[PDB]
Design a protein around this nucleic acid. Sequence first.
RNA 1: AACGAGACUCUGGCAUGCUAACUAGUUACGCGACCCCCGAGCGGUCGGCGUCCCCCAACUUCUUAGAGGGACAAGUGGCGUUCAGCCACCCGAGAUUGAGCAAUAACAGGUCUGUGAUGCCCUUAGAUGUCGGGGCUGCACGCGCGCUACACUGACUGGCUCAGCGUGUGCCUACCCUACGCCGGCAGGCGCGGGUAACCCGUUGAACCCCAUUCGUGAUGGGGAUCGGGGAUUGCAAUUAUU
Lengths: 145, 53, 141, 68, 187, 46, 141, 104
Amino acid sequence: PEKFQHILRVLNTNIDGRRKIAFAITAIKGVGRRYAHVVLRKADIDLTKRAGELTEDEVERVITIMQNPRQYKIPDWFLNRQKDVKDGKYSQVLANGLDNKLREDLERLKKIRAHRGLRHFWGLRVRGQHTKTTGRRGRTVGVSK
Amino acid sequence: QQLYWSHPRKFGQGSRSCRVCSNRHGLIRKYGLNMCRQCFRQYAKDIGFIKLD
Amino acid sequence: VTVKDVNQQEFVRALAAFLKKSGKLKVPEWVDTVKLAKHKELAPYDENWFYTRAASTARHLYLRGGAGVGSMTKIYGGRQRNGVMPSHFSRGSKSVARRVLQALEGLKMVEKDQDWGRKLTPQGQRDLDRIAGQVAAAKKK
Amino acid sequence: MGRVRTKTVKKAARVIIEKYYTRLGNDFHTNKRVCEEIAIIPSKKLRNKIAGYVTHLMKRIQRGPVRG
Amino acid sequence: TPDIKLFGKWSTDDVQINDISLQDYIAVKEKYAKYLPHSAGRYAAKRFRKAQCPIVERLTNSMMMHGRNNGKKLMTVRIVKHAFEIIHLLTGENPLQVLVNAIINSGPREDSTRIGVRRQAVDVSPLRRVNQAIWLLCTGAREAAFRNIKTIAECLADELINAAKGSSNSYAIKKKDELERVAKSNR
Amino acid sequence: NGKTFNQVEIKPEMIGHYLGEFSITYKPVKHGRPGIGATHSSRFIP
Amino acid sequence: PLQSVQVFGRKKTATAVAHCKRGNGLIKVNGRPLEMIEPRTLQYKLLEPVLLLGKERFAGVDIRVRVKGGGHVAQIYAIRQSISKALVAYYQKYVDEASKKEIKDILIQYDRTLLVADPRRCESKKFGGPGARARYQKSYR
Amino acid sequence: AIHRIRITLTSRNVKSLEKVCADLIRGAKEKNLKVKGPVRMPTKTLRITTRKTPCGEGSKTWDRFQMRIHKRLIDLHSPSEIVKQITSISIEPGVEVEVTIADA
RNA sequence: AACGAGACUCUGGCAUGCUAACUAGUUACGCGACCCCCGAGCGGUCGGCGUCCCCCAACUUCUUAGAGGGACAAGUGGCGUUCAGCCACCCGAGAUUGAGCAAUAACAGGUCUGUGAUGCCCUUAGAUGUCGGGGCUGCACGCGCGCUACACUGACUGGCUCAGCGUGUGCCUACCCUACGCCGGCAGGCGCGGGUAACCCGUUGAACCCCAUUCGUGAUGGGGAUCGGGGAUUGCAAUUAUU
């Protein structure tokens, strides 16, 4: 036990030091179940321990692996930003950087006024769905005059 | 007379039609019949199909 | 004692330990990153999964020889959940099955045979019946 | 359930007994063979039902009159 | 030798039925002793044929019930098996005595029929008493397990032990003592 | 557009899109009040 | 001489055939000991005849069983019936008919379907519903 | 010289195929051609299921149509000159007959 | 006296009796071959394991499918204007298997958008008889048939072991079902064979279920809607997203 610290702050977000290490770091945006397992496998960490049982140099090893996947031989087919449209790079985007990357994508579609950008602006379904009977969020209207 | 007087018809409902009455809806491709479903119920006895169950 | 005389689950664990102790079986570089089949949601819990896959595959070739890569993907097939739609059957990874069969040929346990497919050698047959006696003796009958 | 016998069974059994009383008896398996050679019956399942009511009528005729 | 069958682990000869109305309807001992609570028998085909089914198989059938569990009889045999092993550790007694006494205590003996909010009191037959007892104690085990770390094998053991002494902590005893209170007001 | 031609000035950000993505085949909906038969209670007797 | 018999048992689509011959007491199903057929929750179902009659009645014969069709549970009931039906047919041909009666009476007094088949098979589906008796929903307003 | 030679028969109707096949066995047996008996292959069933209505109105009834096909094989030990004789009589009904010069 | 009912036709459950099979199997041996000594006993005649392989061996139990057989309220006990029938039980594979077909007389029921079935009316070269693009999918809102779930009688990761009914190279019309080897995480790609089918895909290695592991009552490792970025395949063409 050692009565060690059981809440910790990692990338401007709070991790509970109380779940299994592979399910604690998925509190970061851009890190799902599948990616969190592969990062800890490259970092040489035992998956059996609770997240409050890592030492100070073990968390810095995990953080420096999450920010640079391609230098620790994580494959290109794993990553969430592929050939990024403005500069051609491959990377994983995390935390408040993922919010801004979506914010730039919706404005890029709106500025040229393509059909995607207009559907996102009017608040309608963007992909191929019908709209007669599903997604209702207004109020019932009466027939009376 | 025009040189462009047809469009491709190598698949879909444009390719196939009934052998008896030239209709395009509800036809049977099973076992090489190529009849319309209303024309099949009319000729089934002469083709040799029967009902038992 | 033959492979038909012993309970099959600890036979797979005894054979997996014999392969992994030898040091001769080669493994691919991507063994720590692959999903193992299309219908799985996560990678396997055990770092040692490739030796267990080879041990089970040799046991399959003893009972029913003449298999190939396509018929190994039907043995390791399973159910896929499709989110909000109904579920269906789905086959295993072809590249894993092909590299596991090629890794057993390098131990001289497997041969490509006449007609088409693969089978065990007399040396492969000897090593499996030798481990079936070890599994029976461990129960002190 | 329902085991009542229709007029096709009951009339054929009476006409057999009027003509062949001297051939018949209490054994169903012998009556079933007699009724196959004295009559043309289209079905095996109808033959069994006729020989059944003939066997019932022989056991009545051994006690007293039957009006038909 | 083959005249005694231990149901895997538990003897039938020492069991007793202490209500003379139920001795014909709780099938235990003799020709009703078997190794497992699983057969393919055609018990549904006539009205009273149901009374010849061993009482441990009737408990096993009534347990594979609630929608997501239909047809899963192999899972339901091991629930009964592990419940009987927990009953023997808690009580020190034969698990078949605990089941028989839980059935004798849980079945209601007066009830009121419906005629128009308006009801009239009537007697209950011994076949309906044994049918009611099984359904009540299966329901009691099923409702307690639904959001607890407790397994259903532990909840079915707790429910049978409380019913065998009539403690009113069980679901089956509270419901029996409700049905007979309401019917006593409709005489 | 199915009845008219809509003009486009091709900005370089449009690269790799289709020409048909900038000329839309319908008018955005804005509702008038519901008519007779729109609900079960709306029934008319002479 | 070739003192031996072949006989079968059934349930649903499953069939099992037992061959028995003069011997020392062997029993096998598909080449495996009957202590090792996979759904071991039902192990007392395929032990029932030898536990009920006692091993002294089996000591003169070797029995080999082959089984296919149906599902996991229907095959246990086919195996069970093939073994008890084979022993009474072997005794009828090669020993005294007074000893056949002991075997048949002890089996039937414990359970029918050790010696007589169960005739039940599926109903066919009918149009207008999901199965044989069920119907799709009906609506009005 | 002699051959091993194979005849196959096919029809919808069963009882015309029975009388055709029995006559091929008699003509071979009386001439000592050492005929191998009729092999019954599995029966083949064709099925079509259709709505009864021409127009899509009414309660939803269906028609279930089927056709059944019956097949047989016989093998002979004889010269190529005499299968041409016996495979030419009693064949009058709507039965297919086909023969191949070596298959045994 | 006639039609409907019933009979009738197909179907399910029984035959160690009949006919008889290299496009179906079993048993056995002239035997032959690999592996194990666990076995009276050796590394064997003799034992164990086989979808390992010949038979110019014997045969039809298991598979196919032709002919016949079998069940009648027939036997025994009660109840019935002692008739017609009804209830229980013995013996038995079996004492209600499930479908098809179906009368007289009607309806302002549906269908002219199934038809070279059809009356009358309309239109007929600025056509109501062919190509290019769009729509049938548009969304404050009311209703109908359904799919997935709210978890521990569970979800996830490994291991083991069982079906039945069918379809298959398109005859204008141009496409079929797939073993085996190699390349790729995957979807997929290249090469080279079999099948016009009891012959090849195929012993159709199906899912739930079964055995072992991890989570711990938390909208949680339950649930997977909504939405960003990248890669294949069909096609003449995929944006209003084919899969």
